[PDB]
Amino acid sequence: PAFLFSGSTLSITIALPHYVDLPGRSNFKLMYIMGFPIDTEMEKDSEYSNKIRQESKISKTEGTVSYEQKITVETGQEKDGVKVYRVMVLEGTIAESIEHLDKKENEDILNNNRNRIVLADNTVINFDNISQLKEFLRRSVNIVDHDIFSSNGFEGFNPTSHFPSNPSSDYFNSTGVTFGSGVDLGQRSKQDLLNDGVPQYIADRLDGYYMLRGKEAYDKVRTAPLTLSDNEAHLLSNIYIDKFSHKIEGLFNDANIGLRFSDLPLRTRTALVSIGYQKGFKLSRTAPTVWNKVIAKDWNGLVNAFNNIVDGMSDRRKREGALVQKDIDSGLL
Amino acid sequence: PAFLFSGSTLSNSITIALPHYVDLPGRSNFKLMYIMGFPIDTEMEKDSEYSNKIRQESKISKTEGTVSYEQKITVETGQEKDGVKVYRVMVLEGTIAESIEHLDKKENEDILNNNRNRIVLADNTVINFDNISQLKEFLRRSVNIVDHDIFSSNGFEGFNPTSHFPSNPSSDYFNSTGVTFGSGVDLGQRSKQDLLNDGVPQYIADRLDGYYMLRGKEAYDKVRTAPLTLSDNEAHLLSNIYIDKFSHKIEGLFNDANIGLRFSDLPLRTRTALVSIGYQKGFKLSRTAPTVWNKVIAKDWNGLVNAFNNIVDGMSDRRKREGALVQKDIDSGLL
């Protein structure tokens, strides 16, 4: 490998090789040369090298790794039954990796070697270049796709205070002053947003819009609107998209389906959060046909379930189903 | 060690990143370790599996000593502390001349100037040097059969790059003296082909045309009527060819005497002293200087100094200078 001892690794004797097995792991002997860890594999039987690890089925282009898992990121080279890889991140979290792989000192090695993730299950994903790796990492870190969530096909995005109902609508009196991607202030106070981690400069701006429902929200928006900068409205939205996502996450995990929400692909999580968000989180009660297929892991059935909801919002239900269907088509489900 | 992979060593591909351990063939207690395709020589006090046991330190003087020019050496650079030593091999069992060239290289400047430098000798013993310049001078002493600077200094054979006639008409040795150059190279019984055979470059051999073979009255007149000045470098090259040719003659005589050591095992200054006396008096020291020769072959260093100091031949001062070189070797522990 080029530049094999440059940069840093995230978590006169050293002139000699020292071999250690990584505690709690199988087939994970490490060799420390010059204080750096090096992961080697051999087809041929050896005392010091690992056996060849199998390649993951996870899509390098569109896949993710669970945000609840630690990963090992390696860079190196391989040819005819022998692999030698510098360990860049050893069982770090995805957020730590992202950060580490951005550091200037690590650019040389990352740019002129083959880059791979060694998963907690000891399978590997081989990336075409470091930018593909970093993008994989950035998909893995988000609970849902916030760009998909805020697109017009889903929750949309309006940075100006808006009232998404009218005086003749069934939902007039429960609708509140809304910002960004469906953040309704009708039953929230300033302290609430502050408690939820909303920056004080944003929460201070919304004074006068809090706790207004029905006619009072409607009139307020009509005469005295307020526009947030896109950066702030996105910030505000994403806090609530993520907060709501953990509620869906918990419902999924509690069901003990044989996987955790974080094991689902990104677009499927987005689809489940989206329908929960519009219909209410208790999908067992608010979308039974959908939840039946989820808890059964019948993904083709799940698509079908979304296609079959006629709830006055089938346009969105079909868009949710298409996200799951995209995961099926790309081999993620 | 600093810059442990930054140079060269005188001695399908992904596999070099794996340490390869190998025993040096036809050689004892010399396990090597190849990391990144570089030989590393390591030593450890307690019983290790793939390193060497601690090597005994040679008694040879790092400041003044030499190693036999007939021996191959191993040159290493690295670090040690508290019973563990790790040295990058820079030259593995190379000749002295080879080592000289290799260590002057622009590649190797960094590793040698920022590490400890040592020689591992053929007998597995070690000489530790204070710096690379010291080690380099140690090599320059070792490579030369005699000290050429001492030889050509005024106290010994002197040096005159101009055709000269070191005698005069009334002198006992007038008729046998020829045209002389550098440090006592006399051409009276030599032809252009004799110099070419001894390895004198064509261009210098060319310059001396018509000075060859002249002796006595004719050499004297030639010097007086048409002198010839060589450059100092041409004259030093010519001289060192003859000094080395003569030194090998003395070496042959010493080695054939079966004293229990070879000529190359003698200190530089003692070798120089023996050649100097032979060069002036006749190489067959057993006949031309028996009191000196008798002490040499008895390895009686003290009596050898005494032999030189007692020679009466009308060249007393030079004889005592030759004795003083040997006495320097005794004083610094080399004899």
Residues of chain A with C-beta less than 8 angstroms from the C-beta of B40: 15
Touching check for B80 and chain A: CB below 8 Å?
yes
Residues B83 and B219 in one domain: no
Dihedral sign for Cα atoms in the order B237, B238, B243, B246: positive
- Alpha carbon distances (Å) from A223 to A174, A208, A218, A220: 19, 12, 9, 6
Residue A260's nearest CA partner among A274, A278, A243, A272 is: A272
Dist. CA A81–CA B232, nearest whole Å: 63
Structure tokens at A208: 């006068």
Structure tokens at B326: 């040997």
Looking at the DSSP assignment, which residues form a beta bridge with residue A116?
A74, A126
Dist. CA B230–CA B13, nearest whole Å: 55
Strand order in the sheet with B180-182: B160-164, B180-182, B185-186
Residue B262's nearest CA partner among B273, B252, B272 is: B252
Size of chain B, expressed as the number of residues it contains? 335
B1 and A12 within 8 Å at the Cβ level: the answer is: yes
Residues B29 and B153 in one domain: no
Domain boundary among A75, A109, A141: A141
**What chain A residue is nearest to B1 in terms of C-alpha separation?**
A12
CA A49 to chain centre: 34
Dist. CA A256–CA A233, nearest whole Å: 35
**CATH number of the domain where residue A194 is located:** 1.10.530.40
Dist. CA A82–CA A128, nearest whole Å: 19
Residues A55 and A136 in one domain: yes
* Residue A109: CB atoms within 10 Å: 22
- Alpha carbon distances (Å) from B162 to A141, B180, B181, B184: 87, 8, 6, 11
**DSSP letter, residue B153:** S
- Alpha carbon distances (Å) from A45 to A41, A49, A50, A82: 10, 8, 9, 11
The phi-psi region of residue B201 (left if phi > 0; otherwise alpha if psi is between -120 and 50; otherwise beta) is: beta
The residue to which tokens 């099926």 are assigned: A328
Residue B38's nearest CA partner among B80, B86, B105, B70 is: B86
Question: Which residues span the domain enclosing A86?
Answer: 1-141
Residues B77 and B208 in one domain: no
Residues A159 and A303 in one domain: yes
Alpha carbon dihedral B104, B106, B112, B117, in 10-degree steps, equals: -20
Dihedral sign for Cα atoms in the order A90, A91, A93, A94: positive
Touching check for A9 and chain B: CB below 8 Å?
no
Residues A205 and A327 in one domain: yes
Helices in chain B by DSSP H: which ranges? 96-104, 109-113, 132-143, 148-151, 192-198, 202-207, 216-225, 232-256, 268-281, 285-288, 290-296, 301-310, 316-331
Q: Please answer whether residues B270 and B335 qualify as being in contact, where contact means their C-beta atoms are separated by less than 8 angstroms.
A: yes
Residues B152 and B117 in one domain: no
Touching check for B155 and chain A: CB below 8 Å?
no
CA angle B95, B98, B102 (to 5 degrees): 140
**Structure-determination approach:** X-ray
Residues B125 and B220 in one domain: no
Dist. CA A184–CA A114, nearest whole Å: 47
Structure tokens at B206: 């060319």
What is the amino acid identity at position A320? Answer: E
Select from B18, B36, B49 the residue whose CB has the most chain A CBs within 10 Å, as the one to mutate to test that interface. B18
Helices in A76-124 by DSSP H: which ranges? 94-102, 107-111
Touching check for A13 and chain B: CB below 8 Å?
yes
Looking at the DSSP assignment, which residues form a beta bridge with residue B44?
B84
Dist. CA B180–CA B211, nearest whole Å: 9
Residues of chain B with C-beta less than 8 angstroms from the C-beta of A77: 14
Residue A290's nearest CA partner among A273, A303, A277, A279 is: A303
Structure tokens at A283: 């999908």
* Residue A136: CB atoms within 10 Å: 23
Residues A54 and A103 in one domain: yes
Helices A266-279 and A230-254: crossing angle in degrees, nearest 10, is 90
Structure tokens at A52: 């060849």
The phi-psi region of residue B86 (left if phi > 0; otherwise alpha if psi is between -120 and 50; otherwise beta) is: beta
Q: How far apart are the first and last CA of chain A?
A: 35
CA angle A191, A192, A198 (to 5 degrees): 90
Structure tokens at B189: 């019984």
- Alpha carbon distances (Å) from A57 to A96, A119, A129, A324, A330: 24, 11, 18, 18, 11
What is the amino acid identity at position A183? Answer: V
Domain boundary among A114, A141, A168: A141
Residue A198's nearest CA partner among A240, A163, A228 is: A240
Q: Please answer whether residues A199 and A190 qualify as being in contact, where contact means their C-beta atoms are separated by less than 8 angstroms.
A: no
- Alpha carbon distances (Å) from A215 to A194, A211, A222, A278: 26, 12, 10, 22
A38 and B19 within 8 Å at the Cβ level: the answer is: no
The residue to which tokens 């760009």 are assigned: A147
What's the total number of domains in chain B? 2
Residue B30's nearest CA partner among B80, B87, B71, B96 is: B87
CA angle B303, B307, B312 (to 5 degrees): 165
Size of chain A, expressed as the number of residues it contains? 333
Residues A114 and A188 in one domain: no
Helices B268-281 and B316-331: crossing angle in degrees, nearest 10, is 160
Resolution of the determined structure in angstroms stands at 2.1
Residues B115 and B248 in one domain: no
CA angle B286, B291, B294 (to 5 degrees): 60
Residues B65 and B190 in one domain: no
CA angle A111, A116, A120 (to 5 degrees): 150
CB under 8 Å to B13, separation ≥6 — which residues? Answer: A79
Q: Please answer whether residues B165 and B219 qualify as being in contact, where contact means their C-beta atoms are separated by less than 8 angstroms.
A: yes
Q: Please answer whether residues A186 and A213 qualify as being in contact, where contact means their C-beta atoms are separated by less than 8 angstroms.
A: yes
The residue to which tokens 């080695």 are assigned: B255
Domain boundary among A141, A175, A205: A141
Element (H, E) at A216: helix A215-223
- Nearest Cβ partner of B4 from A15, A77, A83? A15
What is the DSSP secondary-structure string of B275-292? Answer: HHHHHHH-S-HHHHSHHH
CB under 8 Å to A166, separation ≥6 — which residues? Answer: A172, A218
